[PDB]
Design an enzyme around this catalytic site. Structure first.
Site, PDB file in Angstrom:
ATOM      1  CB  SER A  87      -1.003   0.032   1.169  1.00  0.00           C
ATOM      2  OG  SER A  87      -1.972  -0.995   1.057  1.00  0.00           O
ATOM      3  CG  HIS A 123      11.842  18.454  18.864  1.00  0.00           C
ATOM      4  ND1 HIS A 123      11.940  17.881  20.114  1.00  0.00           N
ATOM      5  CD2 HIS A 123      11.112  17.593  18.111  1.00  0.00           C
ATOM      6  CE1 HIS A 123      11.302  16.724  20.117  1.00  0.00           C
ATOM      7  NE2 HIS A 123      10.790  16.527  18.915  1.00  0.00           N
ATOM      8  CB  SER A 125      10.195  14.433  15.524  1.00  0.00           C
ATOM      9  OG  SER A 125       9.751  14.439  16.811  1.00  0.00           O
ATOM     10  N   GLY A 127       8.276  11.111  14.606  1.00  0.00           N
ATOM     11  CA  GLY A 127       6.871  10.880  14.875  1.00  0.00           C
ATOM     12  C   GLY A 127       6.425   9.466  15.186  1.00  0.00           C
ATOM     13  NE  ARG A 128       6.889   6.259  11.324  1.00  0.00           N
ATOM     14  CZ  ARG A 128       6.351   5.456  10.412  1.00  0.00           C
ATOM     15  NH1 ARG A 128       5.634   4.399  10.787  1.00  0.00           N
ATOM     16  NH2 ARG A 128       6.597   5.670   9.120  1.00  0.00           N
ATOM     17  CB  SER A 133      10.235   6.506  19.205  1.00  0.00           C
ATOM     18  OG  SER A 133      10.269   7.880  19.508  1.00  0.00           O
ATOM     19  CG  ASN A 137      15.006  18.091  22.147  1.00  0.00           C
ATOM     20  OD1 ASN A 137      14.010  18.597  21.673  1.00  0.00           O
ATOM     21  ND2 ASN A 137      14.967  16.977  22.844  1.00  0.00           N
TER      22      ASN A 137
END
EC number: 3.1.1.32
Length: 250
Positions: A87, A123, A125, A127-128, A133, A137
């Site tokens: 997908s 920062h 990231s 997002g996981r 994850s 920072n």
């Protein structure tokens, strides 16, 4: 105007870093770090990579005629488009918002002219959630100077706060990033790298862009090394890609 000056321009939406969309192929895909994803095992080496970078002036003149309290948002994504079987999911996105204080300067030295002096918070990231994850920072300073067709940028930083998802990221990233731009006619050559001496880990990103129109540029990129993305911070690869660009370094 001053080409490439983020702060000067900042003093219709504002760009910060480059904006671009390219179709890429990596030397190897880090299946290990994303093994918890169901689709991970059937992951292909060809992904669409793109970056958005906006700058937002919040308070011009906060410390004088040539200063600004600002913010930026840079986002990079690697998308498994051709993987229709799973997908065509997103493998990875890096969200990198900054709060900063920048000055449009004119300090000349040895033929060079320092044009941007910027200090702020960073920062970065992906997002996981656990276990995919990634996060860190930074307090940084972005410094840019020009010399004819040359542009050089140096962005040293100090890692602050927690880094539990990637304790040793600084081992692969280093403590600064270095940009070199070159104006060959309307063509822009660009060099983007970071390297940690004490460890011998790092990564580079080469680039060539040329205009097709007043707002669109052809663009080719070559990344090689560690830390192309957060989820691939401790993972080496060579990725090459071609596509379009809005704005380059200058």
């Amino acid at each position: 105007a001053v080409r490439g000056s983020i702060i000067a321009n900042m003093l219709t939406l504002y760009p910060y870093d480059t904006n671009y969309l390219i179709y890429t192929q990596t030397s190897d895909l880090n299946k290990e770090a994303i093994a918890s994803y169901d689709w991970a095992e059937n992951a292909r080496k060809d992904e669409v990579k793109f970056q958005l970078s906006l700058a937002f002036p919040l308070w011009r003149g906060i410390l004088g005629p040539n200063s600004v309290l600002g913010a930026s948002y840079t986002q990079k994504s690697w998308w498994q488009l051709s993987n229709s079987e799973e997908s065509s999911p997103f493998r990875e996105t890096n969200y990198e918002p900054q709060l900063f204080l920048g000055f449009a300067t004119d300090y000349r030295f040895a033929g060079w002219t320092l044009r941007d002096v910027e200090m702020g918070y960073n920062h970065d990231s992906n997002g996981r959630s656990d276990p995919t994850s990634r996060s860190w920072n930074r307090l940084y300073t972005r410094l840019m100077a020009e010399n004819g067709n040359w542009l050089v940028e140096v962005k040293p930083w100090y890692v602050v706060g927690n880094t539990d998802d990637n304790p040793d990221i600084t081992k692969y990233m280093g403590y600064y990033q270095l940009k070199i731009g070159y104006h060959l006619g309307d063509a822009v050559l660009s060099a983007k790298g970071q390297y940690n001496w004490n460890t011998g880990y790092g990564g580079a990103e080469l680039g060539l862009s040329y205009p097709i129109t007043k707002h669109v540029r052809l663009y080719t990129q070559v990344y090689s090394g560690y830390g192309e993305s957060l989820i691939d911070y401790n993972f080496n690869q060579t990725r090459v890609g071609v596509g379009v660009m809005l704005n380059d370094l200058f």
